[PDB]
Structure formats: structure tokens, C-alpha cells
Design a protein around this ligand. Structure first.
Ligand SMILES: C[C@@H]1CN(C(=O)Cn2ncc(-c3cc(F)c(OCc4nnc(SC5CCCCC5)n4-c4cccnc4)cc3F)n2)C[C@H](C)O1
Ligand SMILES: C[C@@H]1CN(C(=O)Cn2ncc(-c3cc(F)c(OCc4nnc(SC5CCCCC5)n4-c4cccnc4)cc3F)n2)C[C@H](C)O1
Ligand SMILES: Nc1ncnc2c1ncn2[C@@H]1O[C@H](COP(=O)(O)OP(=O)(O)O)[C@@H](O)[C@H]1O
Ligand SMILES: Nc1ncnc2c1ncn2[C@@H]1O[C@H](COP(=O)(O)OP(=O)(O)O)[C@@H](O)[C@H]1O
Ligand SMILES: Nc1ncnc2c1ncn2[C@@H]1O[C@H](COP(=O)(O)OP(=O)(O)O)[C@@H](O)[C@H]1O
Lengths: 746, 498
């Protein structure tokens, strides 16, 4: 029945598009772009435009917040559709801006923020419709008051659109619920989806939770580095679901009189309870409830008990949800970590490489960014920047664009608003500055991310690409077989081989394949823990992996702790040590987590204590050898990929001449070749500038890495592994290997 | 519950607690339960002042102020009461301190059964795989997993549940039928609350699982089951039963398995403090934590406190030679000191395990302490056959394989590496099965559009696994154990004159 469908989040938006599935649109009687005539809840309909994408699943209908708020529909609701593929034009379309969105910007809004949207964008034009256009550095929205066709009309230059007048006030009877929502959350889509599936039912469906019986999460402990969006995601999941959001940020209450602040918190909870669907969000819970024994006295504990008696005092039949924001909740009171008060503790974490792109896209919506800017180089370069840093970079670029145009902006008495605001056009040249003049907030936190190094990048090693794909992808794709033969899947793999041979690359590729997070604790971090007499910090790292999705917790450069103290011989102590022992102890806990696939990497395995390479722990040894001829050819081609290269070079000859070079030093050879090529190119460029400046007053002296550049780089090459070192790895492999081919009798 | 009172005005919270006790007393059979007693009465010297101690004294004067003729019982809840005020640990106030502990493997099954009563669980779900997989989950985690599975079942049926104005209650609630596919998700999306606490449990590895070693199955059944079944004889001949046994032998030869089987036989708790835990205590300069572990065994029922991989502390610092220090160290010395206290507990049967005994300080292997040495040798021919059959049990196996030939070819492989051979065979068999399954899927997808290419671990899989086998003990290492055994052994058969 195509009449009714359940709404869902849209990704294409365009301020107008409603996304269906063609195998479903055929039932909906729409093919390419036919009008939808979307039917709302109370007393309104929208024309909308039909389109499709991947996430439809032939089950759900997707609408951006413009349509959802226009139709008085919250995400997760059920709505109706009245398909009508017909074309009808209007002549008296009149629109007025919304004072809530225009309260200090004055100009020709019919021309400054309207021209690029009233044609070819297919606005949901219909009397009473409200639409956002996202103009000059502000999410300006308008309402079309009169549309003489209805409920559908052609959005085309044939239809006549008239000029507006003075701004009108927003309808306080409904408030339009603009605020924020899911569409302006980026870089934490998985965490936002987890929160949605965790909190949507109790807030949208409080009626069933009085009958269904099963207790939903009374409180959700959002946490992450400051400025990660905890407040933003909380407010989005509040407004998007229609739940009343009560912010009781810690300092606002801790600053009040002792005893009176307790009353303030209690009456905040009472305010949340008086209306069923409300949610109360406790920002900066570290201040409110830090470690109990680390508090001084009076308020710092008077609140905590007062909080606890209210945190679990609620019966959960009032439909009140207590979300909280903290930083690595190891700091908050352990008493709050109990169940019935905070039973779910999603980790937002810093945005990853491709999440910062989305954050920039959403924040750089109204800036009217120039065409030469890409926002993908900026996202990649902003490594460690938290979403707050991305917003700060956005604002800094905007301010510099204003400040590089203050000469022609202050012509009249300072700013007159006016169309001039569109001229800014923040080019890359301003982003570069903002990025270089902003300090990452969270640069010293283990970043959980899905690495974007695919199987193709790691050429050469092939038996290990299939001997490693097995352990990871077989017990997930067909777990039924593994529970039949009785074997427990091996949640442990350590790569031992010559230094710099793709261990990190192989682990990252494994993470990439099964869309899995990749937490690399490099050797220097383990040395920091060992030297610092803080091996307990290891407990956090493993926990950081546990709270995440399927995670290849990768101990890069393992055995560095032992390598830093001679090893099994040459030192008074034995093989075991602080950090390795703590890793061993905590690993056995994550031997039953069935999502984490602990990986190790070692450049010198024989010093590793054998206590870890036994069943349950990193039992499965894998040997990656130094690349062979064909493998070296593959590595050369793969690591020179994404860089210009001439047809003259034949990588087969280089590979065979590359007799005994590992992956790291082979990529070093490629980097030296590229370095010499860029030096030649820049020298030719400055020489061409010299010619330009002199009397005479062919533009590509070296448009790719030339062959003799590779010649010179190879002449400048260097190898890091000797015959004895490479033989040592195979000799060690003989320890857990055998040549018992004699027992051929089955 | 503590916070409900600690949140009230100082002096007025004292009155609230006092009137709570008065309410308990006004009716004789009432009992008062103090939840989160850590907040109410933490360590006295670690409190700051005012309420945190004003309550405690106010509690103490009421905890023992009751005459016990009013029939009021004051139960309390705490976490490892080493944290609560020691003054409350005195007698006449808290004289019995039972330890609930986390549910064991078979207890989580019952917890799931009771919590999954009203969910109307589907038929394909078993609740025993879920219980086994939920290792470390506390009962609260089991309830959370229950609720998460229920919520996912609702959420995978919200499409046909919100047909009317949201939920109309109605019969539809029976349709949920939370299948395993939802439990799997809930289990994978829940973090164990208590995963770093020594778990007291009755292990479910019976005598049958540990094949081969037989003289030790009867030389170990003796010390454990004779002084409990017929204690009258032991108090007649005068000998005190030996509450100590250390297993020394090649690494990975069933020491942990033998200790677990001993625990299983006499329905006894089994606290294994593996070598890495003792190294954590030694490195951390926190040998006092050992005092807790022994206490954790004392408060439990008959308990084989098992020091798995003992001597790891000495193995981590060279040993008796190669290091400036002597045989003794922090953790081993603390274990020795605390063990003498539990030499008169007559329920605990401290067990040790060592892969390299000669480095162990001999201070522990003398009367009262782990005096009785037991040698488990590397398995022999028949013993290797038994081990093969026992560790391939509970897994499909073909009739083609004849384990006698594998065992004899398995000339010098220990128990651990022999089970490793079996695991490699099963790994290759599962790889072959999954490869055949994906190939069959390929055939299904292509034009043509016999369902058991490999329904058991086949024989050539064992062939290849044995070709991929590996041994962890050499001739010198195995001879070292018997040479050490000669230290406390003799060949004095000359004195045949009675
Ligand atoms: C008592 C015991 C058990 N026993 C049994 O008879 C029952 N039994 N037989 C098999 C299983 C089983 C266990 C699992 F833990 C499991 O996990 C799947 C999984 N899900 N997500 C990931 S993440 C993966 C890697 C990183 C992120 C990207 C993708 N993995 C994953 C991947 C790789 C390795 N390990 C887990 C699946 C299973 F089938 N239980 C008897 C035996 C003698 O002893
Ligand atoms: C002064 C002294 C004594 N003396 C005497 O003449 C008097 N005397 N003679 C014998 C005993 C005696 C002592 C015990 F401690 C005891 O304990 C029984 C027990 N109960 N539960 C378990 S747990 C068991 C193991 C783990 C959990 C699963 C089941 N065990 C147990 C098991 C194995 C080993 N040890 C205890 C029984 C006794 F008979 N007293 C003179 C002498 C020279 O010196
Ligand atoms: N994931 C995100 N998506 C979009 N904006 C974000 C995100 N995280 C942070 N921000 C930006 O950082 C600012 C602070 O947001 P938030 O972290 O929710 O509050 P707080 O910094 O007080 O915790 C907001 O103005 C918001 O625009
Ligand atoms: N196909 C490949 N095989 C091996 N190494 C590669 C390949 N492609 C690139 N590399 C280079 O190998 C390096 C990874 O080194 P890695 O082996 O992780 O060091 P370690 O062995 O110390 O962990 C990267 O710097 C990368 O440039
Ligand atoms: N009958 C048996 N005898 C010996 N070992 C067995 C037997 N059955 C299984 N095993 C294997 O022995 C291993 C136990 O090793 P264990 O001897 O406890 O190591 P350690 O000697 O270091 O304590 C288990 O992993 C198990 O798979």
C-alpha cells in the first residue's frame, strides 16, 4: 500500500527532495521527477519532488528537516502520500521572510538569497509552506503565503513569483521547531544512529512503555573530548523527536547557594517530569559529579547524593530520560556508572577524516564558499580537529573574508547589510590561513576511525591478504559453520617480519574491509606508559576499544617495551614487563567480546615473551616476508599511484634492481624520486620567473616524475635489513613451524 | 539507600537515619537495608569531615545500639567491603558478610530464564549459548541484555506496530518473538560491568575431559576427596591433611585442567590467579592486593585457590640465577605469608602450577604450605590417544581418522600443542567448508541455480594440520623436570628390610 510510509532522514536534501526507491516508486506511480503531493499530519500537504538513493530499502521515505518541519512531522513518524504526476502553473506566488530568520539583515531578499532557489530547485511551493534557502551566512527561511494553484504547482520561470515586503513573525503557536536537528550533525553518524535507536521509542512512544514492561535506558552518558557535539547531538535528538529539552549545565547549578542548588536541580527534574516526553541533559557532569573520594566536601558531594537520589529516584514510567555529557567518564563518580541510572555510555569521539568533510559541509552552508575551495583537503589537513575546531575554522575563514573586504564593505556607515554579503566568496586562500592559525583541541587522544586504505594499496603480499581476510571475514560472514565444527574464532594476530613491511598497512586494510574502527597504539605510546609507571592507563585503551564498534585494536610496533630494555637477554629482568603484562591481563577480558580482533605488530619477534602468543591471546602468528620481485613491482605501482609518472619508467627493471629493499625503504625510494622531481620542477619554475622578469617577458618543464629522477633517487636509496636480520625472522618462525612431511599416511 | 540520606541537611540526615531505625523497630519483624553503604560509611581516615563521619558515628551508635530483642536486622550492600569503615566490620554490628559475586556460567542461564519469562522468546533461541558468551556480565548486565533484545524486537516490528496511533496494546505484543538474531546484537552491544574481578565459579570440566594422566587423577583425587569423605580416619592416624599441591611439568600439560576438574568433582569454587595477575601485583608495587585474593577465597565455599602459572614472578626476573636478587620476591613472599593463615581453613586446598619449578623458592614447598609436589609428565602413547579423543570430542569427526596412528606419530607433543594440532585441523576443515559454501553460493547465483560438501573434520585436514604442527618442549626441558624431581625423590630400594 503506497498511501502510507514511515519517514526517515534524508542525505540529498536540496531543501525540497523527497527520496523513494524506483522498485517502490513504480508502486507510487512516479518515475523520474513527478510531483509527490506529500500529505502531512494535521492540515497541510507539500508538493515535493521524487528521487532515489541507496538507503531507501523499499521500506522508508526520506525527508530533510525543511519538509519535516513544514509538514509538522518529527523524524520517525508515519505519514501519507497522494501521488499525482501532473503539471500546473501558478501566477500569484507571494512570499515573505520569517522574522526569526531575518532580524537584522535587510536588502533585496527577492534577489540576494532567492534567485538560485525559485527555479530549477523545485521548492515545495504551496500556500502556508515554509522553506529554508540558506543564503548569505545565515539560514534565512521564508514562507510562501499565497499559491493560487494547490496543493501542487510548477516551480519554473513560467510561474510568476512576486516581491516580498516587511518581515513577518514566526508562528509561536507551533514555534516551527527550527533549532537544530540531525541534518546539521556530521562526523558521528554511527553514534547518532546508536542514540536514535536507543532513545527514539521511549520519547516518541511513551504509551507502550507503560504496557510493554521492559525498562528503557533511564539515562544515557554521552561523552567525548570537549566541543565534540555532545550538547548538539543531545539537542538534535531532543528536538528531532519532539521531546522537551531541559539543559541543566553543571556550572549553572554548582554556582548557586549550597542547599538551594540542590533545590534547583530537584525542581529541574520536576520540570522534566511534569511533561512526559521531556529529556533533561546534564552538561559538564564532571563538575557536578567527579570522583567521590576526590571531592572536597559540602556541595561537591551534596549535589552528587542529591543527584543520585534523583537519578534513580525516577520510576521511568514518567518517560523522563537523563542524558549526560562528560569527558572519558573514568573521571566522573563511579557510583553514577551503576545500572538503572547510566546504563548506556556511547562514545562520540573526535570526527574522523571523512567526518570532518561533512562537518565542514554543514558548517560551510551559508558562507557561500567559492568554487576553487574543495573542503576535502581542509578536512584531511585538519587532523585532530574536533567539531568545535571545525566550527572555529569556519568562523575564522568567514571573518578573514570579511576582513579582506572591509575596504569595500565600510563604504557607507559601516555595514548596511545589503547584497554585498554574497560577494565574500571564501576561497581556499582564507581556509589555509584559518587552518594554519587554529590549534587542534584533541590531538593527544586515541582516535577511533575507519581507515581509508583499501586492499589495493597494499600490493605484493597476497597469501597474507587471504590468510588474514580469512580470520576476520569468515567468522562474521558465516558464523553458523564456526559454531558447528566447534572451533572458537581466533581473536588475535601478530605480524612478525622485517621492519617497515606493511604491518600497519595490512591492519588498516583489514579495518577498512569490514568497515571497522582501527585503534593503533604505537610503540612510543606503550613506552610512554612503561616509563611513566602508569601501566593502568592500558586499562583505558582496551576500554576505548570495547565501547567502539567492531575494532581491530592494533598494537603497532609491539615488543618496543622489551626492545627498549635490551630484551630477554642483556638485561637483569625477564621477558615480561609492566605494559606487556597489563596488555596480556586486559586482553583475556576482551577474548569474549566477539567484535574486537586484537592485532599485534613486531619488527623483532624473538624477544617477545611467549605468554601472549598462546590460545585465546595473539596465538596466530603471521609472517609477512620482505617483498619479492612481483611483489616489489606491485608495491612500486601502488605507492607511486596518485602521483604523476611518465611512460618512460618501467617499474619491472626498478623492482628487480630493488633486490632486497623492504616496503618502507622502497616507498622511501619513491619519495626521494618525487622529492628530486619536485626540486627540478620548482627550480625550472623559478628560472621561468627569471625569464619573465627580464627583457624577453612551454609551461610544463616537468609535468611528472621523470625517469632520471627515479635513477638518482635509487642511487640515493638505502636498505634497512641485512641478511642476518631477515634470516632471524624465518629462524624464529621455525619455532612454531615444522617440516614433518613424513607423516603422509593421512 | 545511602544517597537518599546523605543528600539531606547535616544533622537532619542523622535524624532521618535515626527515625528510619525507629520505624524498623516499631514493628518487630522488619528489616532495614542500607544500600550503597560505601557512601554512608567509607574508610574513616579517608573521610573529609562533618556528614561523612557524623553519619558513621550516628550509624554506629544505632548499628549496635539495637538490643537485638526488637527483632530488627540491618542488612547492608557494599562493594568489596575493604572500602567501608573498618569500625563497621566489628562483631555485634556486621558479623556475617556473605559474598554474592558475579553469576557463573550456568547461573547466567537461570538469570536469563527468569528475566526472559515474559518476552515470549522464540523457539530457535536457546539462552545457553547467550549465557556462555556473556562472560563477566553481572545480573544487571543480563537484565540490560534482556531489555535490549526486547527493544530491538519492538524496533524491528515498529513498521507493523505503529499502524494505528502508535501502540494500541492488543494481541500484537505476542508476535515479537525475540529470536537469537536479536540476542546476538544485544550481547555484542553490551559492555560487561565486572570483567576485571576474580570470578568464583564451579568449573564444568569433568574428569572425562582430562584424558591420559591417570596416576595423577588418583593421586590428586586422594588428597582432595579422602579428607572430606572420611575425615574420621585422618584424625585417628594423626596426620593432618595436606592443604597444598603444586603441579610441575612441561608447559601446557593440563595443570589448569586438572585443578578445574578437582574443583568440579567436589562441587568447589575455583579461583585462578594466573601468572599475569601476579606480575601485575609485582610490577605495580601492590603486593598487599594479594591479601584480598586470599580473602576472596576465604569468604567462599570449599575453594581450590589455584595459582596458575606460578613462578611467573621469578621467571620475569631471570630467576634464582642471572639476577642480583634471590629467589624470594614481593608477590611470592606475600603469597607465602598469607597462605600460612589459610593452613587452618580446612576448606581451601591451595593449588600451584609451574612450568619451570627449579626457580621456585623452596620456602613454599615445605609442610603446611604447598608441600606435596606432583609431577604430570608429557603424555604417553595411550595418554595422547585419550587426549586426542577428549579434545576432539564435542566436534564432528569422520570415521576415516584413526587417532592411534596420529598419537604415535605425535611422538613428543604436550597437551597444549596437541590441542593446537586439533584446532589447526578444525580451522582448515572450517576453511574448506566455508570455501565450498561460497562456491555453492556462486553456483546458486549463476545460471544453473549435495548440501554437505564437508559435514565433519575430514582426515586430510588432520594430515595438513599435523604437517603444520609445532612442539614447544625440547629434550633438555623435559629432562629438567625429572632432574628437579630427583631433588625430593630417592631410589633407596636397598632398605628392603621392612
Ligand atoms: C566454549 C568455546 C566455544 N564453543 C562453541 O561451540 C561455540 N562457538 N563456536 C564459534 C563461536 C563464535 C565466537 C565468536 F566470538 C564470534 O565472533 C564473530 C565476530 N563478530 N564480529 C567480529 S569483528 C571482525 C574483526 C575486526 C572488526 C571487523 C570484523 N567477529 C570476529 C571476527 C574475527 C574473529 N573473531 C571474531 C563468532 C563465533 F561464531 N562460538 C566451543 C569451543 C571449544 O570453546
Ligand atoms: C595438631 C595437628 C592435627 N592433629 C590431629 O590429630 C587432628 N586432625 N587430624 C586430621 C584433621 C583434619 C584437618 C582438616 F583441615 C580437614 O579438612 C577437611 C576438609 N573439609 N573441606 C575440605 S575442601 C576439598 C578441597 C577443595 C574443595 C573441594 C573439597 N577439606 C580438605 C580437603 C583436602 C585437604 N584438606 C582439607 C580434615 C581433617 F580431618 N585434624 C595432630 C597433627 C600432628 O597436627
Ligand atoms: N558533530 C558536530 N556537528 C556539527 N557541529 C558540531 C559538532 N560538534 C561540535 N559542533 C559545533 O561546536 C559547537 C559546540 O557544540 P557542542 O560540543 O555540542 O557543545 P559543547 O562544546 O558545549 O559541548 C557548536 O556550535 C557546534 O556547531
Ligand atoms: N604495498 C606495500 N607494502 C609494504 N609497505 C608499503 C606498501 N605501500 C606503502 N608502504 C609503506 O610502508 C610503510 C608502513 O610501514 P610499517 O610496515 O607499518 O612499519 P612497521 O613494520 O614498523 O609497523 C608506509 O610508510 C608506506 O609508505
Ligand atoms: N587431557 C588433556 N591433557 C592436557 N591438556 C589438555 C587436555 N585436554 C585439553 N588440553 C589443553 O591443555 C590446555 C591447558 O594448558 P595448561 O596445562 O593449563 O597450561 P599451563 O601448563 O601453562 O598451566 C588447554 O588449552 C586445553 O586445550
Amino acid at each position: 500500500r503506497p498511501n502510507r510510509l514511515i519517514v526517515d532522514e534524508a542525505i540529498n536534501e536540496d531543501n525540497s527532495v523527497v527520496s523513494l526507491s524506483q522498485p517502490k516508486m513504480d508502486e507510487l506511480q512516479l518515475f523520474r521527477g513527478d510531483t509527490v503531493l506529500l500529505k502531512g499530519k494535521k492540515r497541510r500537504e507539500a508538493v515535493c519532488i521524487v528521487l532515489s538513493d541507496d538507503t531507501c530499502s523499499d521500506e522508508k521515505i526520506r525527508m530533510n528537516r525543511v519538509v519535516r518541519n513544514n509538514l509538522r512531522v518529527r523524524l520517525g513518524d508515519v505519514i501519507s502520500i497522494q501521488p499525482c504526476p501532473d503539471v500546473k502553473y501558478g501566477k500569484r506566488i507571494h512570499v515573505l521572510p520569517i522574522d526569526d530568520t531575518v532580524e537584522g539583515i535587510t536588502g533585496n531578499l527577492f534577489e540576494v538569497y532567492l534567485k538560485p532557489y525559485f527555479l530549477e530547485a523545485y521548492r515545495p511551493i504551496r500556500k502556508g509552506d515554509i522553506f529554508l534557502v540558506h543564503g548569505g551566512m545565515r539560514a534565512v527561511e521564508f514562507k510562501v503565503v499565497e499559491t493560487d494553484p494547490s496543493p501542487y504547482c510548477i516551480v519554473a520561470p513560467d510561474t510568476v513569483i512576486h516581491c516580498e515586503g516587511e518581515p513577518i513573525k514566526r508562528e509561536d503557536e507551533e514555534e516551527s521547531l527550527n533549532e537544530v536537528g540531525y541534518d546539521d550533525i556530521g562526523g558521528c553518524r554511527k553514534q547518532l544512529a546508536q542514540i536514535k535507536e536507543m532513545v527514539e521509542l521511549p520519547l516518541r512512544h511513551p504509551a507502550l512503555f507503560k504496557a510493554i514492561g521492559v525498562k528503557p535506558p533511564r539515562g544515557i552518558l554521552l561523552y567525548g573530548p570537549p566541543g565534540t557535539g555532545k550538547t548538539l547531538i543531545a539537542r538534535a535528538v531532543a528536538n528531532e523527536t519532539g521531546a522537551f529539552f531541559f539543559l541543566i549545565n553543571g556550572p549553572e547549578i554548582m554556582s548557586k547557594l549550597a542547599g538551594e542548588s540542590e533545590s534547583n536541580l530537584r525542581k529541574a527534574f520536576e520540570e522534566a517530569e511534569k511533561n512526559a516526553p521531556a529529556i533533561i541533559f546534564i552538561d559538564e557532569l564532571d563538575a557536578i559529579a567527579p570522583k567521590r573520594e576526590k571531592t572536597h566536601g559540602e556541595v561537591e558531594r551534596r549535589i552528587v547524593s542529591q543527584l543520585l537520589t534523583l537519578m534513580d529516584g525516577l520510576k521511568q514510567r514518567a518517560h523522563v530520560i537523563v542524558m549526560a555529557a562528560t569527558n572519558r567518564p573514568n573521571s566522573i563518580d563511579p557510583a553514577l556508572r551503576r545500572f538503572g541510572r547510566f546504563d548506556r555510555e556511547v562514545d562520540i569521539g573526535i570526527p574522523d577524516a571523512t567526518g570532518r568533510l561533512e562537518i565542514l559541509q554543514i558548517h560551510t552552508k551559508n558562507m557561500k564558499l567559492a568554487d576553487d575551495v574543495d573542503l576535502e583537503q581542509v578536512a584531511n589537513e585538519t587532523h585532530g580537529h574536533v567539531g568545535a575546531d571545525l566550527a572555529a575554522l569556519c568562523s575564522e575563514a568567514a571573518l578573514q573574508a570579511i576582513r579582506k573586504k572591509m575596504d569595500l564593505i565600510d563604504l557607507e556607515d559601516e555595514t548596511i547589510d545589503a547584497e554585498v554579503m554574497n560577494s565574500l566568496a571564501v576561497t581556499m586562500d582564507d581556509f589555509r590561513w584559518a587552518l594554519s592559525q587554529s590549534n587542534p583541541s584533541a590531538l593527544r587522544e586515541t582516535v577511533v576511525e575507519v581507515p581509508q586504505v583499501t586492499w589495493e594499496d597494499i600490493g605484493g603480499l597476497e597469501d597474507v591478504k587471504r590468510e588474514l581476510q580469512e580470520l576476520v571475514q569468515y567468522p562474521v560472514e558465516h558464523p553458523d559453520k564456526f559454531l558447528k565444527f566447534g572451533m572458537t574464532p581466533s581473536k588475535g594476530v601478530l605480524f612478525y617480519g622485517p621492519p617497515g613491511c606493511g604491518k600497519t598497512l595490512l591492519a588498516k586494510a583489514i579495518a577498512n574491509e569490514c568497515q571497522a574502527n582501527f585503534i593503533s597504539i604505537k610503540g612510543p605510546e606503550l613506552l610512554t606508559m612503561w616509563f611513566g609507571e602508569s601501566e593502568a592507563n592500558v586499562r583505558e585503551i582496551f576500554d576505548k576499544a570495547r565501547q567502539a564498534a567492531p575494532c581491530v585494536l592494533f598494537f603497532d610496533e609491539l615488543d618496543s617495551i622489551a626492545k627498549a630494555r635490551g630484551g630477554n637477554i642483556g638485561d637483569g629482568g625477564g621477558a615480561a614487563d609492566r605494559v606487556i603484562n597489563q596488555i596480556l591481563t586486559e586482553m583475556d577480558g576482551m577474548s569474549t567480546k566477539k567484535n574486537v580482533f586484537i592485532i599485534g605488530a613486531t619488527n623483532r619477534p624473538d624477544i617477545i615473551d611467549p605468554a601472549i602468543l598462546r590460545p585465546g591471546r595473539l596465538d596466530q602468528l603471521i609472517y609477512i616476508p620482505l617483498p619479492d620481485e612481483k611483489s616489489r613491482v606491485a608495491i612500486l605501482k601502488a605507492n607511486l599511484r596518485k602521483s604523476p609518472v611518465a611512460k618512460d619508467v618501467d617499474l619491472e627493471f626498478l623492482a628487480k634492481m630493488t633486490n632486497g629493499f623492504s616496503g618502507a625503504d622502497l616507498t622511501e625510494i619513491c619519495q626521494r624520486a618525487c622529492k628530486l622531481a619536485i626540486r627540478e620542477s620548482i627550480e625550472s619554475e623559478i628560472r621561468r620567473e627569471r625569464e619573465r622578469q627580464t627583457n624577453p617577458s612551454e609551461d610544463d618543464p616537468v609535468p611528472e616524475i621523470r625517469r632520471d629522477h627515479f635513477e638518482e633517487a635509487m642511487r640515493f636509496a638505502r636498505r634497512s635489513v641485512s641478511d642476518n636480520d631477515i634470516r632471524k625472522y624465518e629462524m624464529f618462525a621455525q619455532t612454531l613451524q615444522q617440516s614433518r612431511g613424513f607423516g603422509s599416511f593421512r
